[PDB]
Structure formats: C-alpha cells, structure tokens
Symmetry: C2
Subunit: 354 residues, 2 copies
C-alpha cells in the first residue's frame, strides 16, 4: 500500500537483531541438522587430530569449489560450541570441542536421533497451523496442532504409520535415558537406598532400569510399557497400558519423562490408582521437570524449559508443570508429602509419599 | 564413565536441544504476529487479563490455558510483560515497539518473509546441495535455487509479488531506522556532497532521510523496475531510476552508496562493479567516494557473543538464499585494493552494521 530523535532510532536499530535472532532460530535447527546429515563430528574424530578444510571437504564428498561454504558452516558450528578452528598456515583446521561428545555416533548418549526427530516435517509443519488451531472452538477441533495438521492423528498414530520417525523418537528417548539414569542414581542415591523393587512405567527398552539395577543390586526392576530390550538378572518386563491397565506392585513407582506428556485429568486418575497400590506404604518417584525449581531457574535454562513447553504443547498433550501445579495434583491424588532432589538436564526427582 | 562426567553431559544436553529446537522461537514469534497480539494489547490501552485477551484474539475461552503458555514464552523472549495485580494480565515490553503495525519501522514483514516456506524449505536440501558437483548438471548457485527448480530469489521476487512485498517491506522497515542512525553517527561522511546514488536503494527510506538531512545532496535510487514502480518515499531532491546494476550503467554521483547490497553477491561480480565505481568516481580527475552500509563481521561494535551469533545466523541465511556473505575486514580490504581504491574509514552505526567510506 501507500507509504523520532536520533538516540531513539539508534536504540531501536540496535534492538532489531534480538528479533532477527528469534525469528531466524530455525537456522540453528537446520545448520545442526546439516552437521549431522554430513557426519561432521564423526569425520573429524576419525581424522584423529585437527583436519584441514580441504581434507574435510574431501572426506565429506563436498566439491572443492564448495569448501568456502563448508568453511562458513563450520564457523557457525564453532560458534555454537561443537568444534574449534585454527589457521596453521601464515586454510582453517578443525577439531572437536566438548559439546561435540553429544553428536558422535559412537556415543550411546549422542543426540542425533532426537535432533532428526525434532526438526522433522512432522513436528515443524504443524506450527504453521498453530494460530488456526488456537482459534478453533468445539467438530473441527483436535487435541493439539500436530493432530490439527495430521488429519486428526495424534503423534502415536503417526508413529505407527511412519517407522523411521517412530524409530527416531525411541532412539532419542533411549539416548537421554542413558545419561539421565546415570546422573539420577548418583545425584539421588539416597532415594534408592532401602528399596527391594521398582516399576519403571513407560520404561521402554529398559535403559533407565538397567542402570538402576546395575547400581543397586538389590532392586528388582520391572519395566511396564505398551529394538532388543536391555538384559539384567534383576530386570524384567511387563506389557500394559498405564492408563487402563493396573500398574504392577512395587516398593517404588517411577515415571521418567512420562507425566509431562499428559494433562491433569488422566494424570490425576493414574496417581490416585498409584496411591491405592502404594498403600504398607511405597513411594512415587517422578523424574521430570519442575518448571520453576531453583536448580533450573537461570534464564538460559528457563528459555529451554519454555521451548520444551511449546514443543509439548504442539505435539503432545502435556506441559512442564511448576511445583505448585505438581503439589496440587499430589494433594488431590491423596498423597501427603513430597521431596524434590535436583538431578540435571532441566529436571529433578520428586519423591512423593502416600 | 564416572558420575561427574554423566552429570556434566546431562547438563550440556539442553544447549543442544535449544539449538535444534530453534524453530520454536521462529514459530512462536510468527504466531504472535499472525494473532496480532502486540496491536491488540496496545489498542486495549492498559494491561489485559488472560480471558479478555483470548476474546480479543478470537481464541475460544476453552483454549485460554494454551494462550497463557504462549504468552509465558513471549514474555520470556521479551515482547510482553506480565503485570502482577494480586488470572495473568499482560502488557507491552520495549521490544514490542518493533511488532506494532502502526510503526513504520516494525519488523512484521521481515519476520513473515524470513520464516516463509520459500526460505525454510531449501534447508532440507542443503546437505544435498553442498555435495553437488558442477558436472551432472544438477548444480545451482545456492540451496534456495536448488529447491526452487533452479530459480534464484530476485527472480522469484519479480514473479511473486506477495513474497516480494514482504522482502521489500522488510528492507524498508530496517532502512527507516538505519538511515536515521546513519545521518547522525556519520554526519561528516555527507559533507560536501552534491549528489549520491543509492544502488539497490529499494523504496527509498535510506535516501529520503539523506535528502532531508543534507539539502545539497540530490539522491537517486537505482533499483529493479518491479521495486520502484509502486509507492515509495518521495522528496523534491530524490528520484528513482530503474535497471540492473550488473548490466546497466550506474548513475553518476559524488557518492555511490550500497546499503545491504554487496552482501548479496559473490566476490567476482562485486569486484567488477567496484572497479566500475572507481572509474566513475575518478572521472575528469575529480574524486568522489564509495559508501558501503553493511556488515563488517569482525568489527568491535558487533564482536560480542550475542551479536556474533546473530551475524553468523545471517551469514547462514545469506548462504542459503542469496549469493553473498557477511564479509570480514580482511575480505573487504582485499576487494578495495583489487578495485583500485587507496584508503578507507569504518564508522559504527548499529544493528550489526557499519559505514565504510572508501576513497579512490
Ligand atoms: N541486479 C540488480 N540491480 C539493481 N538492484 C538490485 C539488483 N538485484 C537486486 N537488487 C536490489 O537490491 C536490494 C537489496 S536489499 C537492500 C535494500 C536497501 N538498500 C535497504 O538496505 O533497505 C533490493 O532492493 C533488490 O531489489
Ligand atoms: C540485500 O538484503 C540483505 C538481507 C538482509 C536480511 C536480514 C534479515 C533477514 O531476516 C532477512 O530475511 C529475508 C534478510
Ligand atoms: C520429539 O522431540 C523431543 C521430545 C521430548 C519428549 C520428552 C518426554 O516425552 C523432549 C525433547 C525433544 O526434542
């Protein structure tokens, strides 16, 4: 259509890049995904020492004519903290920074699958219909934007149609469990002392329970859930629906990154069922986010937590709860006391006593 | 692996999530613009409760809890504030000046342009493009063209007036602010000029401010026909000429200005054009000057970690959809030398950018 003092103009001019940085956030996603697609971290690691740009391009099957673009991509990734670069000719050479441990294929805790899963069309595309879903009232409505953009299908049904996407999700969860469980049994050692049995609800391939069982040789761990499963003498598996099937009895019931996927109604119903079972008393163990906890209250951590809340809002049916929200559920479910112990990775352990 | 190493890696993991979940920032901001949140709150005139805000955005009351969560995200990003009254009430933060429709410097169009399918999608073919040789005939100058059946962006703009309008409006909004900073912080750069050609000057926001601030300077914006045939800034000492800077003669002037233009293009055509400017700027023994309003990637004014992060993000954006980069001082100085220039001066302006005066 048709078509301020200097100090104010400069201030506003200088404020723009903060906005650009926000709306160009997808550039971080896509640059990281490229690094993974190209196996950059692995190729550098295989080299065994800093690798010159030309040799890196060659190993990546990037034409020498495009090495300058590879160089710019590396500069971005160095800034993100994955790699380092130096110029040994008076021609950059690249090596690994500590954050790259999380990209290496050889590490069972690498984040490759979660990355591919997270930036997949399945999870990004629905956001272009988020405004419409938000404005949809109650027969065109769906539980979330994901379903809104997948003809009514929630993520679990889409997982059953898309084996690759499903595999990425599971591998991504398994990778996190590898690291989280090792931090959990160390940071929260006292929470496992005294137990003879634990049920790991949504425990999947048993990565969490394997570590508990190996660390605390007297705990009989049972994974209760809907690749080959981890083996341990004190680790077994039971098939079931946590919402509509009865949870096996044990000294402790564990929910690792599970309750965050669901809204208060089905969570409360399940907790009430857990309170009945756990009562001689056992205890509830929740390894998950307490959004406003002191241990993750710094702005960087809060930013990432809130980003997860948005991610979950779009494709799951849960959220990252505050202590107040958790405490209300515990109270309503009939539990009497809880104790929070920080673990790491934005998450804590909540022990809840019936 | 000992426990301490496991905890350290577990605590480093969220940095990675934050990286790959970057698009959530993009999409939450775009939602805020789609929903007109800033404008609706501003029009309300004072902090607005959650339930009233839902109604004002035509979000059903049953979806208010989701709106609350989106606002919590946007408050953290710094666009809005939550005002404590004892439901949450919401108000505007300083950053929201850049979202309001009534401000001629708002960043709405640039945001929509930037997160558009045209610019996001080619990234899913970046690895394939990087691995493409100039032999099997599938090569293109960048991933954008690779993903657009060989079409480059300024071609897509001449054919797609909507996306094109987003991009030119986006540039205009920045120019509105940048030009006001420029004439203030670099006032001396305009001394003694009687003419200036703003090459790729768009819809004239830059030259309009130059012309008003420096009455002796006749300003000519030189851009493509589809950019300067519509509404644009007007002034008695400002006019527009159309053409292609690579194939047509640039208008003669005491100063040649490139604002956010040289960064779109690779060294070879940039050098050729700078050589042309050096010749033009030294005709008949009299010397003009070259002015570049652009990124100097390693300049002190944008050397901090946050600024550098945004510069490199732009370098990536430009790599995908343009044919240029954010050049370091080393890269610029080499071009100046090869083009035949004899001196330069760099003065910071703002928004990651500087003025380079280049003298023949
Ligand atoms: N071949 C060409 N000849 C002249 N202008 C061109 C061109 N190719 C692209 N452009 C123009 O260069 C500009 C780049 S974006 C910069 C616009 C303006 N200087 C500003 O800073 O706000 C666009 O207006 C685009 O239309
Ligand atoms: C010659 O044009 C320079 C382009 C600058 C630009 C800056 C930020 C953007 O988001 C963006 O997205 C389109 C473009
Ligand atoms: C699909 O991508 C993600 C999923 C989760 C889910 C956690 C608990 O269900 C956490 C982080 C991610 O990036």
């Amino acid at each position: 259509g048709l078509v301020m003092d200097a100090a104010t103009a400069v201030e506003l001019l200088d404020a723009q890049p903060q906005v650009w940085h926000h709306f160009l956030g997808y550039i971080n996603s896509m640059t990281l995904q490229c690094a993974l697609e190209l196996d950059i971290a692995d190729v550098i690691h295989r080299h065994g020492h800093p690798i010159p740009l030309n040799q890196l391009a060659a190993a990546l099957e990037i034409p020498q004519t495009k090495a300058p673009f590879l160089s710019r991509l590396m500069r971005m990734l160095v800034h993100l903290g994955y790699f380092t670069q130096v110029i040994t000719k008076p021609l950059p050479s690249y090596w690994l920074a500590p954050l790259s441990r999380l990209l290496l294929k050889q590490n069972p805790y690498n984040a490759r699958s979660l990355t591919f899963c997270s930036v997949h069309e399945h999870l990004v595309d629905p956001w272009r219909q988020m405004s419409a879903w938000l404005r949809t009232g109650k027969g065109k409505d769906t539980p979330n934007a994901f379903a809104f953009a997948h003809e009514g299908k929630k993520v679990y049904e889409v997982c059953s149609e898309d084996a690759n996407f499903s595999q990425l999700f599971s591998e991504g969860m398994a990778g996190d469990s590898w690291l989280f469980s090792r931090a959990l049994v160390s940071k929260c050692r006292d929470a496992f002392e005294g137990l003879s049995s634990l049920v790991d609800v949504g425990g999947g391939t048993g990565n969490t329970s394997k570590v508990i069982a190996e660390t605390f040789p007297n705990i009989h761990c049972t994974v209760f859930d809907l690749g080959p499963k981890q083996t341990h003498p004190n680790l077994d598996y039971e098939s079931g629906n946590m919402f509509t099937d009865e949870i096996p009895h044990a000294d402790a019931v564990l929910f690792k990154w599970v309750l965050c996927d669901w809204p208060d109604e089905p969570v409360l119903k399940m907790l009430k069922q857990c309170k009945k079972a756990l009562t001689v008393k056992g205890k509830l163990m929740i390894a998950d986010h307490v959004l406003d906890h002191e241990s993750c209250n710094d702005s960087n951590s809060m930013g990432t937590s809130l980003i997860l809340d948005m991610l979950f809002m779009s494709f799951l049916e849960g959220s990252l709860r505050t202590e107040k929200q958790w405490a209300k559920l515990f109270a309503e479910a009939g539990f009497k006391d809880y104790k929070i112990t920080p673990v790491g990775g934005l998450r804590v352990l909540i022990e809840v006593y019936p």
